[PDB]
Design a protein around this ligand. Structure first.
Ligand code: G0P
Ligand code: G0P
Ligand code: G0P
Ligand code: G0P
Ligand code: CA
Ligand code: CA
Ligand code: CA
Ligand code: CA
Lengths: 121, 121, 121, 121
């Protein structure tokens, strides 16, 4: 299992110790408060009122937690994933990333605290 | 395991199929959008800007997900709990509840979708 | 989880720290060598060649590992149980017992080493 | 998870659907009766009275269940393994094998029924 902080201003993402392998079942729980620029902060589902202006993940709101697994595209995490299996041919290191527009992370603030574990399979 | 919806206007709370027993380890993941009255909606951590005016759980924001286990007091759930063990002598049916002031649930809207499972122990 | 030894001469059984509750899934692995009297020893499945002369569990061989859950009848364990659920209305403390005829435990020898854990549910 | 039969006469071993990856925790439970030649049969710990005359696994009795993980040497399984982690650098497909001397499997009989699953990690 892995526990750690994902900074909202970390454009490259937070690498975890989790390597997702074929057949794995995982659970993620994310908590905390972060911002993509405004003084207000949002939880790991992000800001439901904000337009997508080129987010790294178009399937989650700006300010949401997302992830990549190896060479995958971004996959929404939001508050977490319960006993979750990846799509076919998706495998590798899990990197967690705050959802913002590339090149616009410098004014971000806050962080999410995230647990990831492998479940029975 | 249990999956279901917790309505923000449900003052009595949503009873689950989970009976927490001594020694159990549980994981909860909650998602979605709800309001305690305003047109805006918040995620399961609630509204970090809103003053506590008599919430059923003083350890979580207004609009957060909380729970009772048997005859316990309220316990924060927020976005979820990862491989969590209850305090001593806490046991019984898990009921999930939206955090608001007693008597003020009628103007609430939305809901959270919640998974609960028992982990290895 | 519980790990401990079950002596072949222990007529009363070895009480464990496991309380089986409704809905629980458990795994048991048993190992080792024991005898119901002869110089030879057998593993947790017991002696397949020996007639049942009034065993506490008629559904397992003499010398097998069996269990009781609360006030249940005896249930075969043998080498173990994989992600196992009890029959309806079966619940309570798990006691592990060597399968022999009542009153004939005094000449028994050896023991089994047993792990029990609760699985995801 | 995998469930299947391991024939005592199968010199090459039974390939399973389990790929052991770094960090994985696994549980195995094995049951049944098999022989390395004699009319008698033994459980998955094999025959404690039989000399090692060139067994594929010198750390288990003749007639015991053993395994290889990828290109590993043989590892005893016996009645099973509880929440088990492999030695460093051991990974790959799990193959289950009856412990006998190479070239002597033709007179073997019986089989073990085996479950393998991955546990939380
Ligand atoms: N009178 C003021 C008008 C602005 C209101 C609003 N636009 C925004 O609210 C807005 C808010 C914050 C922003 O912050 C920037 O977000 C980017 C990602 O989209 C980057 O993260 C930047 O770093 C961040 O500053 C951008 C637009 C707007 O026009 N809306 C809101 C719904 C559609 C109409
Ligand atoms: N010019 C307008 C002034 C109001 C602004 C604000 N007060 C509130 O924002 C407020 C907002 C929503 C409320 O909704 C009610 O919340 C209750 C729980 O506290 C019940 O759920 C009611 O059903 C709900 O309507 C109550 C107060 C306020 O005074 N603040 C905000 C920080 C401290 C100072
Ligand atoms: N020429 C010798 C004849 C004896 C052989 C055998 N009977 C037994 O092998 C036997 C062996 C051990 C026993 O030990 C006792 O077992 C009891 C439980 O059954 C108690 O545990 C006693 O403590 C133990 O001594 C009893 C009978 C027998 O008659 N068989 C074997 C298959 C059916 C026919
Ligand atoms: N009067 C008869 C003497 C034989 C008794 C015994 N040797 C064996 O019991 C024995 C039994 C079965 C065997 O079966 C063969 O085992 C091989 C693996 O070791 C292969 O599996 C062969 O296929 C199988 O036939 C081999 C030796 C022996 O000498 N012992 C037993 C303890 C040490 C002294
Ligand atoms: Ca930004
Ligand atoms: Ca309200
Ligand atoms: Ca006896
Ligand atoms: Ca042989």
């Amino acid at each position: 299992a892995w526990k750690g902080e994902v900074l909202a201003n970390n454009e490259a993402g937070q690498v975890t110790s989790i390597i997702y392998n074929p057949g794995d079942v995982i659970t993620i729980v994310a908590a905390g408060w972060a911002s993509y620029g405004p003084t207000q902060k949002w939880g790991p589902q992000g800001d439901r009122e904000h337009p997508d202006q080129g987010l790294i993940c178009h399937d989650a709101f700006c300010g949401a937690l997302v992830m990549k697994i190896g060479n995958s595209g971004t996959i929404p995490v939001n508050t977490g994933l319960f006993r979750w299996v990846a799509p076919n041919n998706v495998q590798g290191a899990i990197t967690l990333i705050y959802n913002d527009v590339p090149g616009t992370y410098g004014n971000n603030s806050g962080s999410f605290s995230v647990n990831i574990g492998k479940d029975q399979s």
